[PDB]
């Protein structure tokens, strides 16, 4: 008279299938990308242009000597 | 692919446990007979299949 099945206490667990979490898609991407990339080239032309100014100063000390 | 082999067999060893508790042995159990099951399964296995499944 000592046998298994309980009178109660059950679930069940699902048979389902779901993890579609979105996700920042669909014109949200391709907009943060271009907005990041244009910040890069804007951070250029303030350094590459400025290094071009110090470049001429480096040639300047050459030319003021050599006679 | 390396991991889903390892990711499932680590979980699979919760289920070769269940053969040993009922028949006596690890994989090849001589349990089913031509007149039904050999012997009764112990007090348990319904609070342990249920936690597993």
Curated annotation (Swiss-Prot), chain A:
Subcellular compartments: Mitochondrion inner membrane; Nucleus
Residue numbers of the full-length protein present here: 7 to 73 of 144
Protein name per its UniProtKB record: NADH dehydrogenase [ubiquinone] 1 alpha subcomplex subunit 13
Quaternary structure note: Complex I is composed of 45 different subunits. Interacts with CARD15, but not with CARD4. Interacts with STAT3, but not with STAT1, STAT2 and STAT5A. Interacts with OLFM4.
Similarity-based family: Belongs to the complex I NDUFA13 subunit family.
Top-rank lineage group of the source organism: Eukaryota
Summary of the function given for this chain in its UniProt record: Accessory subunit of the mitochondrial membrane respiratory chain NADH dehydrogenase (Complex I), that is believed not to be involved in catalysis. Complex I functions in the transfer of electrons from NADH to the respiratory chain. The immediate electron acceptor for the enzyme is believed to be ubiquinone. Involved in the interferon/all-trans-retinoic acid (IFN/RA) induced cell death. This apoptotic activity is inhibited by interaction with viral IRF1. Prevents the transactivation of STAT3 target genes.
Organism: Bos taurus (Bovine)
Record-annotated membrane-spanning stretches: 24-45
Curated annotation (Swiss-Prot), chain B:
Compartment(s) of residence: Mitochondrion inner membrane
Superkingdom of this protein's organism: Eukaryota
Complexes and interactors: Core subunit of respiratory chain NADH dehydrogenase (Complex I) which is composed of 45 different subunits. Component of the iron-sulfur (IP) fragment of the enzyme. Interacts with NDUFAF3. Interacts with NDUFAF7. Interacts with CERS2.
Function: Core subunit of the mitochondrial membrane respiratory chain NADH dehydrogenase (Complex I) which catalyzes electron transfer from NADH through the respiratory chain, using ubiquinone as an electron acceptor. Essential for the catalytic activity and assembly of complex I. Redox-sensitive, critical component of the oxygen-sensing pathway in the pulmonary vasculature which plays a key role in acute pulmonary oxygen-sensing and hypoxic pulmonary vasoconstriction. Plays an important role in carotid body sensing of hypoxia.
Similarity section: Belongs to the complex I 49 kDa subunit family.
Protein name stated in the entry: NADH dehydrogenase [ubiquinone] iron-sulfur protein 2, mitochondrial
Organism listed in the record: Bos taurus
């Amino acid at each position: 008279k000592q046998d298994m099945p309980p009178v109660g206490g059950y679930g069940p667990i699902d048979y389902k299938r779901n993890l579609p979490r979105r996700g920042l898609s669909g014109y949200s991407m391709f907009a943060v990308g271009i907005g990041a990339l244009l910040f890069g080239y804007w951070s250029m032309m303030k350094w590459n242009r400025e290094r071009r100014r110090l470049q001429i100063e480096d040639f300047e000390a050459r030319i003021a000597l050599m006679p | 692919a390396m991991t889903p082999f390892f990711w499932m067999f680590e979980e699979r060893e919760k289920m070769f446990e269940f053969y040993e508790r009922v028949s006596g042995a690890r994989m090849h159990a001589a349990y089913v007979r031509p007149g039904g099951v050999h012997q009764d399964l112990p007090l348990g296995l319904m609070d342990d299949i249920y936690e597993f499944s």
